[PDB]
Coordinates of C-alpha atoms and ligand atoms in Angstrom, one line a residue:
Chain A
X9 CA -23.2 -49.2 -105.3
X10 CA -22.2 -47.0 -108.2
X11 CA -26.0 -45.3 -107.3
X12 CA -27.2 -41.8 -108.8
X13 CA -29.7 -41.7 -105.3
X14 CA -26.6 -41.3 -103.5
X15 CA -26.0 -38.3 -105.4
X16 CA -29.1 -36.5 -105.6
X17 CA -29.8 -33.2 -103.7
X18 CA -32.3 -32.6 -101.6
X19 CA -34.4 -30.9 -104.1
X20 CA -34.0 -33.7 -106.7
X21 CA -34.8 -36.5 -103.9
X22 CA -38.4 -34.3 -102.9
X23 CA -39.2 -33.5 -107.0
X24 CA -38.8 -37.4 -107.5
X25 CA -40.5 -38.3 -104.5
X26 CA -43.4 -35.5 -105.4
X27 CA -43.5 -36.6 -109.1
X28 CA -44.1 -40.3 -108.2
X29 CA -46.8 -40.0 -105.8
X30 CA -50.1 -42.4 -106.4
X31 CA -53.4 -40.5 -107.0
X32 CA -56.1 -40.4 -104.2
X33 CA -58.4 -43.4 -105.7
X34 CA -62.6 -43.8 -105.4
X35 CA -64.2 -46.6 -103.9
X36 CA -66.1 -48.4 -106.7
X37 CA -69.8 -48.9 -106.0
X47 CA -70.1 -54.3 -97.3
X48 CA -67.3 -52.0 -95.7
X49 CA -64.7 -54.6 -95.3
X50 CA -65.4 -55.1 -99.3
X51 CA -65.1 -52.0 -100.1
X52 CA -61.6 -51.0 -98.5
X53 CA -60.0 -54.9 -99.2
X54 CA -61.0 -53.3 -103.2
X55 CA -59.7 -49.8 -102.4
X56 CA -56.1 -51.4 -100.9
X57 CA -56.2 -54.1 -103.8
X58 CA -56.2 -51.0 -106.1
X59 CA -53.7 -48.6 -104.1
X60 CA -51.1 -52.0 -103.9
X61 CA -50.8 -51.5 -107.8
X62 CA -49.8 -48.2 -107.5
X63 CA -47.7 -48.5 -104.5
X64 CA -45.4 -51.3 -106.4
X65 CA -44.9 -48.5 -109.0
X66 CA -44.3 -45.9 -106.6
X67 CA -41.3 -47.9 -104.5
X68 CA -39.8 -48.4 -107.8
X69 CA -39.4 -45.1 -108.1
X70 CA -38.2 -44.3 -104.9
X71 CA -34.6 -43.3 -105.1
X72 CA -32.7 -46.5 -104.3
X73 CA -35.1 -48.8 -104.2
X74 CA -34.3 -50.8 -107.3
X75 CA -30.7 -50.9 -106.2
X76 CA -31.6 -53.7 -104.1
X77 CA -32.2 -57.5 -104.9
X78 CA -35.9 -58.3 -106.3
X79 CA -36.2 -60.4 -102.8
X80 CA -34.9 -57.4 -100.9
X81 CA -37.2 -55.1 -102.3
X82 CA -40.2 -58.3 -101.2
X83 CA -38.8 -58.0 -97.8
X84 CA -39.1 -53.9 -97.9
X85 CA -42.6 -53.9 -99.3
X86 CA -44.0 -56.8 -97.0
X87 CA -43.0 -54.9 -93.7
X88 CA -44.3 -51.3 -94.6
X89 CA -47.4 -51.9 -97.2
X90 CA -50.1 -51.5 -94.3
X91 CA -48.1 -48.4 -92.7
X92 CA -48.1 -47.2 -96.2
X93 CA -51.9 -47.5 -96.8
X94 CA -52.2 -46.1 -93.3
X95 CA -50.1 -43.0 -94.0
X96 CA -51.6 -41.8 -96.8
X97 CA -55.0 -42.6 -95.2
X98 CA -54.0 -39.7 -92.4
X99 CA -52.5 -37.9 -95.1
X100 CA -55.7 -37.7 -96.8
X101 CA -58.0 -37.4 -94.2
X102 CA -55.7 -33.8 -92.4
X103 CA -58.4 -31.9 -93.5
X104 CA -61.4 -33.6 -92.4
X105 CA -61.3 -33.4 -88.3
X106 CA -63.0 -36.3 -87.1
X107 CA -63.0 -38.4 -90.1
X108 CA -61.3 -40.6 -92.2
X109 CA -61.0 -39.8 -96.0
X110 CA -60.2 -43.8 -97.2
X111 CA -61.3 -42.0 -100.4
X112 CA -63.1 -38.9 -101.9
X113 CA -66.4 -41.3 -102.0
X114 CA -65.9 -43.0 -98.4
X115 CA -65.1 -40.4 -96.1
X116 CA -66.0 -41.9 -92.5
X117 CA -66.7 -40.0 -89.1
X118 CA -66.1 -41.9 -85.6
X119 CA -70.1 -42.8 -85.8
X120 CA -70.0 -44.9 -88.5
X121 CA -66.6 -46.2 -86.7
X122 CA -68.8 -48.2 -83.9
X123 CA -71.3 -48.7 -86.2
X124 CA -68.9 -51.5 -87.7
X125 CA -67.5 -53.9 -85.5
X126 CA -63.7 -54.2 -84.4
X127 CA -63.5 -50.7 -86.7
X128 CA -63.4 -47.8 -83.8
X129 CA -60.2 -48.8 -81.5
X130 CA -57.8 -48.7 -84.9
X131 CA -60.1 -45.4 -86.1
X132 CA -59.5 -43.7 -83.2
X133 CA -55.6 -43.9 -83.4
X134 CA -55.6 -43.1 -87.5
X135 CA -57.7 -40.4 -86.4
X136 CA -55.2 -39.0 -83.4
X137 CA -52.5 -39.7 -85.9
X138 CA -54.4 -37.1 -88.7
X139 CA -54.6 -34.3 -85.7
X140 CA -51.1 -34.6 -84.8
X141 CA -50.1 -34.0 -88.5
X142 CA -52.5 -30.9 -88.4
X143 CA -51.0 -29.7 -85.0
X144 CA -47.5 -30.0 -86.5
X145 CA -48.9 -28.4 -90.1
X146 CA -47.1 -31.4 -92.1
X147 CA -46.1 -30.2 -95.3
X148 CA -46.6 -32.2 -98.5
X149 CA -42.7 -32.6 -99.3
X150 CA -42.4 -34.1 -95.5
X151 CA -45.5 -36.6 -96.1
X152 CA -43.5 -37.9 -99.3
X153 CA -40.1 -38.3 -97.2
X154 CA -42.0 -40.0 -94.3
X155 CA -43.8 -42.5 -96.6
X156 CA -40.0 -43.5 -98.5
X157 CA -38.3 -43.9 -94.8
X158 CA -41.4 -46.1 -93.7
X159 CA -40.8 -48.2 -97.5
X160 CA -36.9 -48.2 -96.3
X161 CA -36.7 -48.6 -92.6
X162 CA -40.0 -51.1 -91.7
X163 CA -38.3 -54.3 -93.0
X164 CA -34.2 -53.2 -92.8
X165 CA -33.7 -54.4 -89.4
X166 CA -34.9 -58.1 -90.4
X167 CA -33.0 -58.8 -93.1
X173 CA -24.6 -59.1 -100.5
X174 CA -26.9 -58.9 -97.3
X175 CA -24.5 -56.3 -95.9
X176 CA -23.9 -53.9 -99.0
X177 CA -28.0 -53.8 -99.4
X178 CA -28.3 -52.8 -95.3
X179 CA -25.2 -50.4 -96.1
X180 CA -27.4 -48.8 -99.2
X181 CA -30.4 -48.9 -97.2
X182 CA -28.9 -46.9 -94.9
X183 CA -27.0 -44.2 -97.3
X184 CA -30.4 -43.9 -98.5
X185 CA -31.9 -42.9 -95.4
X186 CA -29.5 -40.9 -94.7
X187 CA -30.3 -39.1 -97.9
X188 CA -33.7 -38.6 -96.7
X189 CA -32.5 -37.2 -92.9
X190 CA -30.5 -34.6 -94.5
X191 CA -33.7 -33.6 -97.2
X192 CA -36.0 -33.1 -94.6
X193 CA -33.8 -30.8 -92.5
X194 CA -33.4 -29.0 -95.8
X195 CA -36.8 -28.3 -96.1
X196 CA -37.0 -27.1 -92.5
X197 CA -33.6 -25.1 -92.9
X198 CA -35.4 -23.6 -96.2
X199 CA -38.4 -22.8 -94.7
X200 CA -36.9 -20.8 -91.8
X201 CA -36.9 -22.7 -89.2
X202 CA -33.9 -22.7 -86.4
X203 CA -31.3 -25.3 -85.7
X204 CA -32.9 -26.2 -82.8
X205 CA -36.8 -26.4 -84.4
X206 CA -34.9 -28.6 -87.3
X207 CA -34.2 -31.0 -84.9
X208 CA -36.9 -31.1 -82.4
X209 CA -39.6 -31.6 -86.1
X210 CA -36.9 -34.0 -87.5
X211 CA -37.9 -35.8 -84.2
X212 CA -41.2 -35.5 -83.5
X213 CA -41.8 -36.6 -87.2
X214 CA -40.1 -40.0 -86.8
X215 CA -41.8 -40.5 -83.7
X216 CA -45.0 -40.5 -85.3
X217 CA -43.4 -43.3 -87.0
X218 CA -43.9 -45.4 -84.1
X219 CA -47.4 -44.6 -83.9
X220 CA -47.8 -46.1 -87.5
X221 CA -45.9 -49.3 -86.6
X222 CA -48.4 -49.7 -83.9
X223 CA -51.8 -49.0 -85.7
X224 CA -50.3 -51.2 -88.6
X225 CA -49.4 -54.1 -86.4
X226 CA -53.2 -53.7 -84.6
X227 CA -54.5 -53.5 -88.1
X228 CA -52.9 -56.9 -89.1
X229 CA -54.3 -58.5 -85.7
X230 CA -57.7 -57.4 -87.0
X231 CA -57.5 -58.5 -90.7
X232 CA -56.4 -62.1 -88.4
X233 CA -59.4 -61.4 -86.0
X234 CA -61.7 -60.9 -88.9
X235 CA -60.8 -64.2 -90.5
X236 CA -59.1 -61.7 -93.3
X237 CA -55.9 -63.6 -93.4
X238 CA -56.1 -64.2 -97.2
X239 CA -56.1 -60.3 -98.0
X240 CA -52.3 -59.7 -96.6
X241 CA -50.2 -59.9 -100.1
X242 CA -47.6 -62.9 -100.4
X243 CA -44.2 -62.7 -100.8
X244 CA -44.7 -64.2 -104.0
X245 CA -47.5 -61.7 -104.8
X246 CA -45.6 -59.2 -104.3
X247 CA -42.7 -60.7 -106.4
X248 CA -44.7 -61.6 -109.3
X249 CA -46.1 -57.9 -108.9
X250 CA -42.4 -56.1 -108.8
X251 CA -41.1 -58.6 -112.2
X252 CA -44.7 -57.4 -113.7
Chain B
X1 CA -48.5 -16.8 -73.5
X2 CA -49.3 -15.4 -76.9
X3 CA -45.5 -14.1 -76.7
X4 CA -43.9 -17.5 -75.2
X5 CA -45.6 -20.6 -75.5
X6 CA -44.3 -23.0 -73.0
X7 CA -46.1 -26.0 -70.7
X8 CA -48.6 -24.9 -68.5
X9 CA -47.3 -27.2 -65.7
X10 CA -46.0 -25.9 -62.7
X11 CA -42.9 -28.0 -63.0
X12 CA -39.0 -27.3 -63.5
X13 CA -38.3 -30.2 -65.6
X14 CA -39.0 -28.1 -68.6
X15 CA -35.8 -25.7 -67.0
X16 CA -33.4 -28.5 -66.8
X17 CA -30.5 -28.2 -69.3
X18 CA -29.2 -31.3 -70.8
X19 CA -26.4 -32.0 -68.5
X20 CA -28.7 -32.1 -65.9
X21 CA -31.0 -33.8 -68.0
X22 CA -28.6 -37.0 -68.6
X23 CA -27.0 -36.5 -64.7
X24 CA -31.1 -37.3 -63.8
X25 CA -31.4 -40.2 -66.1
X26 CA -27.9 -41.9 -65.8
X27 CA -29.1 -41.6 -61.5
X28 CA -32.2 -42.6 -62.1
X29 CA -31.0 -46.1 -63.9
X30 CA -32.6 -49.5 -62.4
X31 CA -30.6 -52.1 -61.0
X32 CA -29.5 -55.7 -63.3
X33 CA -31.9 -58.2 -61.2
X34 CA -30.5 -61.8 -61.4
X35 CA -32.6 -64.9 -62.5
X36 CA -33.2 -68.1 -61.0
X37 CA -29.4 -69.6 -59.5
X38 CA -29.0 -73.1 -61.4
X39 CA -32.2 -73.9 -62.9
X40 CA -33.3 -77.5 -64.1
X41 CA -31.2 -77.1 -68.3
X42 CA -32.6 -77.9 -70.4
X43 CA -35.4 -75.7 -70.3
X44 CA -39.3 -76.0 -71.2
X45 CA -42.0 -74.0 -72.6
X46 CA -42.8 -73.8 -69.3
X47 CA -40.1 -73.5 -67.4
X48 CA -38.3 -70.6 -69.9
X49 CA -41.6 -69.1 -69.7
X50 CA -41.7 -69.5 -65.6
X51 CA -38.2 -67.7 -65.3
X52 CA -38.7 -64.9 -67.8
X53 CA -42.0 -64.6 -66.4
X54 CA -40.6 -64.0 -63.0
X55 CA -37.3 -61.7 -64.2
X56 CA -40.1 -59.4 -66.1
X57 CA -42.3 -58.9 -63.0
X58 CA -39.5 -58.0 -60.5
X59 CA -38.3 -56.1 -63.2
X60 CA -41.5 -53.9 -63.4
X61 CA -41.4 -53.0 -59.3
X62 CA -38.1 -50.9 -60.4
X63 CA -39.2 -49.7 -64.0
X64 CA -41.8 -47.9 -61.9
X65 CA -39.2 -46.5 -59.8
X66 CA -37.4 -45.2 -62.6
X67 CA -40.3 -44.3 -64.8
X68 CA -41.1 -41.9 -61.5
X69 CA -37.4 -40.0 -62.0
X70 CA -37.6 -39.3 -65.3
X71 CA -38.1 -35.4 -65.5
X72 CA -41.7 -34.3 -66.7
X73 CA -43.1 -37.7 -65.8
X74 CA -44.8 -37.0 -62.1
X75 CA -46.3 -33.7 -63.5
X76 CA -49.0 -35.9 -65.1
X77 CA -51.9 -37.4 -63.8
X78 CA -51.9 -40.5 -62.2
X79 CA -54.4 -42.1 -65.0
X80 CA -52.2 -40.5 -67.8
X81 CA -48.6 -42.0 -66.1
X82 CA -50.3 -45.6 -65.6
X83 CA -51.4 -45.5 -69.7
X84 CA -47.8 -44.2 -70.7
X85 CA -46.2 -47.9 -68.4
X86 CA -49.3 -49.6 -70.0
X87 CA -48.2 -48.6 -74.0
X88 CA -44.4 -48.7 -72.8
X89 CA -43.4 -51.7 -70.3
X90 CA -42.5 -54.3 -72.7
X91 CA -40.5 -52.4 -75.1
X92 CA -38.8 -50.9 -72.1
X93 CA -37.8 -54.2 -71.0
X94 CA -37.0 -55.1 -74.5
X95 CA -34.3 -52.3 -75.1
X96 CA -32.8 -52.8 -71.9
X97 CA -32.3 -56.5 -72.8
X98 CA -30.9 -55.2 -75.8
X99 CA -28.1 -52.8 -74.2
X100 CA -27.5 -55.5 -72.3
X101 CA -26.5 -57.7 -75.1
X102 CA -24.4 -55.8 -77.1
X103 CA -21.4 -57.2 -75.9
X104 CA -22.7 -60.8 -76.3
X105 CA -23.0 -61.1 -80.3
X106 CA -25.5 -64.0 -80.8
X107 CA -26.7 -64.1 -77.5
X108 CA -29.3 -62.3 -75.2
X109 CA -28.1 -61.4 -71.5
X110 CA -31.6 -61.7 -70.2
X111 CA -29.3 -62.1 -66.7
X112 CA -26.1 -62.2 -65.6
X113 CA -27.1 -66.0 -64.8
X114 CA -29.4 -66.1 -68.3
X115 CA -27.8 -65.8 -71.0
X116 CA -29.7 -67.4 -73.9
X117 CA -28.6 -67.8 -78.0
X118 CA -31.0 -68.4 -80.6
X119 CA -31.5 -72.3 -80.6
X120 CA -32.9 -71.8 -76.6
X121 CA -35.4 -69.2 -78.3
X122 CA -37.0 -72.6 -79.9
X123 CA -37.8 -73.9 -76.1
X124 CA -40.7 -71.5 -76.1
X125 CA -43.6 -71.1 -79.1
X126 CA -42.7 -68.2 -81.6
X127 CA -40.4 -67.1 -79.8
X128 CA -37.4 -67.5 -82.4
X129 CA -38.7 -64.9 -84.9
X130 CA -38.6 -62.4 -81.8
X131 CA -35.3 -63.8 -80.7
X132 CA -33.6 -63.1 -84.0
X133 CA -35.8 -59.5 -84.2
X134 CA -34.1 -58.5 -80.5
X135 CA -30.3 -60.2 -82.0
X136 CA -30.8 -58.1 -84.9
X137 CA -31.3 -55.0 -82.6
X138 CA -28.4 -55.3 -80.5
X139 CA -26.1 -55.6 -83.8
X140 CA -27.5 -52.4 -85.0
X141 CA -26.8 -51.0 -81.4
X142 CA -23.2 -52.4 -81.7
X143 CA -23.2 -51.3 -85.2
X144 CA -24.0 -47.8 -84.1
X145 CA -21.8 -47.5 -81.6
X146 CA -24.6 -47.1 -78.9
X147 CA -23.4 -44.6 -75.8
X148 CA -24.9 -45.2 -72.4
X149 CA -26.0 -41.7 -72.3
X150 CA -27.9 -41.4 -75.6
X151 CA -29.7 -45.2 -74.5
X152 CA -30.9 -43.8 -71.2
X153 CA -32.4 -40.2 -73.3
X154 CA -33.9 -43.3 -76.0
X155 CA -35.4 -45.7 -73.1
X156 CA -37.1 -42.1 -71.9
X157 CA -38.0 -41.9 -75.4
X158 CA -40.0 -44.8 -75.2
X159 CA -41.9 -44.4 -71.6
X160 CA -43.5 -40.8 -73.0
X161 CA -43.8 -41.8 -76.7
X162 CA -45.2 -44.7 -77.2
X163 CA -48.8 -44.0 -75.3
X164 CA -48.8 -40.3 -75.9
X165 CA -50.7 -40.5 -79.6
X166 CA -54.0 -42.9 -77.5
X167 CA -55.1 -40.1 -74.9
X168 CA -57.9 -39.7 -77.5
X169 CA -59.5 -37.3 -74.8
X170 CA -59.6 -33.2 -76.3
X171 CA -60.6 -31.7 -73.1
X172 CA -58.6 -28.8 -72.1
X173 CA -56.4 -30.9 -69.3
X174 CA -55.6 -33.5 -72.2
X175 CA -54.1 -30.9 -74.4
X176 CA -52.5 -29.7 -71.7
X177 CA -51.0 -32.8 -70.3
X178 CA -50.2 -33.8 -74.1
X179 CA -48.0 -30.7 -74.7
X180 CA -46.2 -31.4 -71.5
X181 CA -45.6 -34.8 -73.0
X182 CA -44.3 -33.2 -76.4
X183 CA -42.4 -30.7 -74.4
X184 CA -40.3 -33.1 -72.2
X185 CA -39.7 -35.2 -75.5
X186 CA -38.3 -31.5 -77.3
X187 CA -35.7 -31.3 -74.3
X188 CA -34.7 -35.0 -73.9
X189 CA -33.8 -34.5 -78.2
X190 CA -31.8 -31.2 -77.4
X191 CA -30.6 -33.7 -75.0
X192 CA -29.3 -35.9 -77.5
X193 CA -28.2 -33.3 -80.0
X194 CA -26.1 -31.8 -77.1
X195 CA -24.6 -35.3 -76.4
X196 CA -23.4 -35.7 -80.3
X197 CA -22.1 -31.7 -80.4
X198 CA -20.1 -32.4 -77.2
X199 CA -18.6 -35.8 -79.2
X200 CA -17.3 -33.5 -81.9
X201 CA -20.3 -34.8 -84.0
X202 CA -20.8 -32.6 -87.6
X203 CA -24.3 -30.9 -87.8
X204 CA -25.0 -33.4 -90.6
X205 CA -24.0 -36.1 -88.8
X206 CA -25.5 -34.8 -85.4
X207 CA -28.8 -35.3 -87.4
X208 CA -28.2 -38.2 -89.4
X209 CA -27.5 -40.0 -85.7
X210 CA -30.3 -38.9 -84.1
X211 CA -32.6 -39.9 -87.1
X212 CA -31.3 -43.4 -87.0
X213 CA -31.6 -44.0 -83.0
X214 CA -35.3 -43.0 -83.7
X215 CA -36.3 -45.1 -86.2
X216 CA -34.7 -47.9 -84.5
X217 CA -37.5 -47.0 -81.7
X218 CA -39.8 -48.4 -84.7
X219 CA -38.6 -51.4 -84.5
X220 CA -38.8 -52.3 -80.8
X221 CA -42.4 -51.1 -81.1
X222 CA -42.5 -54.0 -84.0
X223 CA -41.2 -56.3 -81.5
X224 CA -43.1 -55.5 -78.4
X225 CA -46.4 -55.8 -80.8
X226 CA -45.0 -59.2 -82.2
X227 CA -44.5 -60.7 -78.4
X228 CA -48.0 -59.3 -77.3
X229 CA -49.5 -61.3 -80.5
X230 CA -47.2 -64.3 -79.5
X231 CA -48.1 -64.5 -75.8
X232 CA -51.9 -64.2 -76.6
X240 CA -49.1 -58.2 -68.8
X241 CA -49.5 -55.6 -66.0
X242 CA -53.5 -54.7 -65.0
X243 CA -54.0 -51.1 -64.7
X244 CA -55.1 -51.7 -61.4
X245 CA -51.4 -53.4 -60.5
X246 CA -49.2 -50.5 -62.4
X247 CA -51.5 -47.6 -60.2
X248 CA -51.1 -49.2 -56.7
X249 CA -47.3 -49.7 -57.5
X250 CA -47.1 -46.0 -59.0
X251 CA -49.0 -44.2 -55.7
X252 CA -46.5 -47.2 -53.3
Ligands
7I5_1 O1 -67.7 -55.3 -91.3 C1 -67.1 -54.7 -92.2 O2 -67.6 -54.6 -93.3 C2 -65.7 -54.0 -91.9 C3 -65.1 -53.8 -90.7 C4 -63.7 -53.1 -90.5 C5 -63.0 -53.3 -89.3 C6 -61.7 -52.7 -89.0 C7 -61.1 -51.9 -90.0 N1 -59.8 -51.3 -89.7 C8 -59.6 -50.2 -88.7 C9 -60.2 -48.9 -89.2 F1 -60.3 -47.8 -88.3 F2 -59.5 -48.4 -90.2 F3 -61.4 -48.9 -89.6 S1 -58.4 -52.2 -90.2 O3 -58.7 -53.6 -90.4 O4 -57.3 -52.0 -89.3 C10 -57.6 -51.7 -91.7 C11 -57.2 -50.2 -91.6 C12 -57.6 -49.6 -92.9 O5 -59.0 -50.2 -92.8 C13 -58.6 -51.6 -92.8 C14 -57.6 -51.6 -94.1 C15 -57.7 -52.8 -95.1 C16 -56.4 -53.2 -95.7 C17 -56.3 -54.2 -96.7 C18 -57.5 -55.0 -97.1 O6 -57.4 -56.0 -98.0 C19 -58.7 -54.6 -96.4 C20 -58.8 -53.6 -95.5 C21 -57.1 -50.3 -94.2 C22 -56.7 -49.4 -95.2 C23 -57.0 -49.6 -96.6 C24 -56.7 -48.7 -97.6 C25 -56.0 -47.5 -97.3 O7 -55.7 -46.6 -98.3 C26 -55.7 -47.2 -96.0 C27 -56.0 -48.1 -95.0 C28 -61.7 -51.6 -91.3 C29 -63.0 -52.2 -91.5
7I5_2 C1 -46.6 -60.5 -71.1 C2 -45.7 -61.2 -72.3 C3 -45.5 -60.4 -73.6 C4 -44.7 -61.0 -74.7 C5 -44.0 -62.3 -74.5 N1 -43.1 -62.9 -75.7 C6 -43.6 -64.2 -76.4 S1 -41.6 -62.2 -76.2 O1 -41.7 -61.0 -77.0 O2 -40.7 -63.1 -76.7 C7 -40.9 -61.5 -74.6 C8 -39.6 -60.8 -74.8 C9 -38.6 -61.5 -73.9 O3 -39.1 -62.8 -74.1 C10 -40.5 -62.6 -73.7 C11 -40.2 -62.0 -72.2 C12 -41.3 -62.1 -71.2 C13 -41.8 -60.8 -70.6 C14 -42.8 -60.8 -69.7 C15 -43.4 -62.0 -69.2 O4 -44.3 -62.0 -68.2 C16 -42.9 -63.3 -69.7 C17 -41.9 -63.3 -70.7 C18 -39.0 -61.3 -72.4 C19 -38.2 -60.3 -71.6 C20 -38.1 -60.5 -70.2 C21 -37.4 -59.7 -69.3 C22 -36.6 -58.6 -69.9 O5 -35.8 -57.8 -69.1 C23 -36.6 -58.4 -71.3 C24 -37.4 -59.3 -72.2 C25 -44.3 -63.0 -73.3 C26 -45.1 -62.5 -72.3

C-alpha cells in the first residue's frame, strides 16, 4: 500500500478520527421498534464513518463487508456506553430514550444484556475514558472484529499497520497527558480488555435479536455492500 | 491509603515481581491429557462429540488445579473464583488447543493421539466455521511468533478477565474483590512488558506486541461465544466442589 494512514501522526489519526464521528441521534416518536429504527438510522452513519477511518478504504469493497459485518453491533454498543458515562444506572440509547435498570425487567430478555452495557459504562467512568480514546477504541473494534476471519495477505498486513497506528496514538495520548511508562501500558491494556467485554455483550445481543425472532434486522452482506458503493 | 492505593487483600501476589510472576505460571502449567487410544475412524457426530466431550471434562479437573496457582486467584471468594472458571473455561481450553497447534499448520492437536484438520471439523454440526476460526488463531500465533512465557501471562489473562466486567454486585466487598482482579491483571501486563524489554524489544514495539496479543483475546471470546451458540458445560455446583477438593 502506497497509504497516507500509514503516515499520519498521532495527532492527525485522533483529529480524523474526532472530525468523523456520527452525531448522538433521537428516537423518532414498542421498544424493540424504537431501537431496530434508532440502529437502522446510526448504520447510515456508521458506513460514512468507517469510510473515513484512516485505512479503511484501502481495502477491497468485500473486505471492508467482512470488517463492518463483524464489529457493527460492538459499534452500536460502544457508543451506547459511551453515551450513557454520565448517566449511572442508565442507558442513554438516545437523548429521548434514556433507560434505567427498571424499565430493563420491565421488557423481557432486556435486563441480562443491560446489566453488562451498564457494568461496561462504569468501568469507562472508573478509568475516566477520554473522548480521543473512545474514538481509537471504536476504529480498532471496525479493524480487529472481522481480521482474524478473513491480495488476502497485503489487506491482513494493512490491517495490521493500521492498528498499529492506532497502538502507538493512544500511548501518545497517555504519554501527552502525563502519564508514566508503566500507567501507559497497564491503560493501553485495560482498554483493550474491555474489548472483550464488547465482543461478549455483542455476541449475547445477536443470540437475542435470534431469540426474539429478530433475525431479519442483522444487515446482509449485500446490504451492507450496496450501502458502502451508495 | 489516600497516599498509596493498593488492594486491600491480605495477599503477596500483588508483591511478586515478574520473574516470579512467570516462574509461578510456567510451574503452575497443566499436564497434555491423551484421548481415546485407537478409536472406531471414521468418526460421528457422536462419537467426535463423545471423545472431545471426554478430553474437555478431564481437562477441567486440572484447569482447576491450575486456575488455583495463578497468583491473586485464591484471594477471592469462593463464589467470585467459580464465576471467573464459569466466564473463562472454554476459551481457556480453546487457547491451549491453539498453542498446541502451532506447529501443526492446518491441523488442530486436540491430543497427541487427536489430531484433527478441517474436513474432520464437518463430522460434527457447525463445527467447521469454529474449526477454521481456531486454524486462523494458531496462524496468527505462528505468525506472531508466540513465546511460551507470554501464552501462560495471556491464558491468566483470560481466567481473571473474561468474568470480571458481570460481578454486577457494588457492595463494598465487590469493589474490593474487583480491584484485586484489576490489580493482578496490572502485574501480569508489567509481566508481559518485562518479557518483551528483556527480548531486546523497542518501547514502540514492546507496545505494539502487547496490543496485538490482547486483541487476539477478542477473538477467542468470539470463538468460545460461537461454540456455546453451536452446542445449544460445567454446573456451578460441579466447578465449587472441585475448587474447595
Ligand atoms: O419487547 C420489546 O419491545 C424489546 C425488547 C428488547 C430486548 C433486548 C434488548 N437488548 C439488550 C439491552 F440491554 F440493550 F436492552 S439487545 O437485543 O441486545 C440489543 C442491544 C441494544 O439494544 C438492542 C439493539 C438493537 C440493534 C439492532 C436492531 O435492529 C434492533 C435493536 C441495540 C443497540 C441499538 C442502537 C444503539 O445505538 C446501540 C445498541 C433490547 C430490547
Ligand atoms: C460444552 C460445549 C461448548 C462448545 C462446543 N463446540 C460446538 S466447539 O466450539 O466447536 C468446542 C471447541 C472444541 O470443539 C468443541 C470442544 C468441546 C468442549 C467441551 C465439550 O464438553 C465437548 C466438546 C472442543 C475442545 C475440547 C478440548 C480442548 O482442550 C479444546 C477444545 C461443544 C461443547
Amino acid at each position: 500500500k502506497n497509504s497516507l494512514a500509514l503516515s499520519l501522526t498521532a495527532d492527525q489519526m485522533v483529529s480524523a478520527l474526532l472530525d468523523a464521528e456520527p452525531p448522538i441521534l433521537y428516537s423518532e416518536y414498542s421498544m424493540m421498534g424504537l431501537l431496530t429504527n434508532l440502529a437502522d438510522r446510526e448504520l447510515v452513519h456508521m458506513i460514512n464513518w468507517a469510510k473515513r477511518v484512516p485505512g479503511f478504504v484501502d481495502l477491497t469493497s468485500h473486505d471492508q463487508v467482512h470488517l463492518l459485518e463483524c464489529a457493527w453491533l460492538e459499534i452500536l454498543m460502544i457508543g451506547l456506553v459511551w453515551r450513557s458515562m454520565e448517566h449511572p444506572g442508565k442507558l442513554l440509547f438516545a437523548p429521548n430514550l434514556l433507560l434505567d435498570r427498571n424499565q430493563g425487567k420491565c421488557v423481557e430478555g432486556m435486563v441480562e444484556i443491560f446489566d453488562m452495557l451498564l457494568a461496561t459504562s462504569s468501568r469507562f467512568r472508573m478509568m475516566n475514558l477520554q473522548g480521543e480514546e473512545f474514538v481509537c477504541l471504536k476504529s480498532i473494534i471496525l479493524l480487529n472484529s472481522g481480521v482474524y476471519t478473513f491480495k488476502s495477505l497485503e489487506e491482513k498486513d494493512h490491517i495490521h499497520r493500521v492498528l498499529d497506528k492506532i497502538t502507538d496514538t493512544l500511548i501518545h495520548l497517555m504519554a501527552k497527558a502525563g502519564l508514566t511508562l508503566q500507567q501507559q501500558h497497564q491503560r493501553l491494556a485495560q482498554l483493550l480488555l474491555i474489548l472483550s467485554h464488547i465482543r461478549h455483550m455483542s455476541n449475547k445481543g445477536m443470540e437475542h435479536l435470534y431469540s426474539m425472532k429478530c433475525k431479519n434486522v442483522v444487515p446482509s452482506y449485500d446490504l451492507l455492500l450496496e450501502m458502502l458503493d451508495a
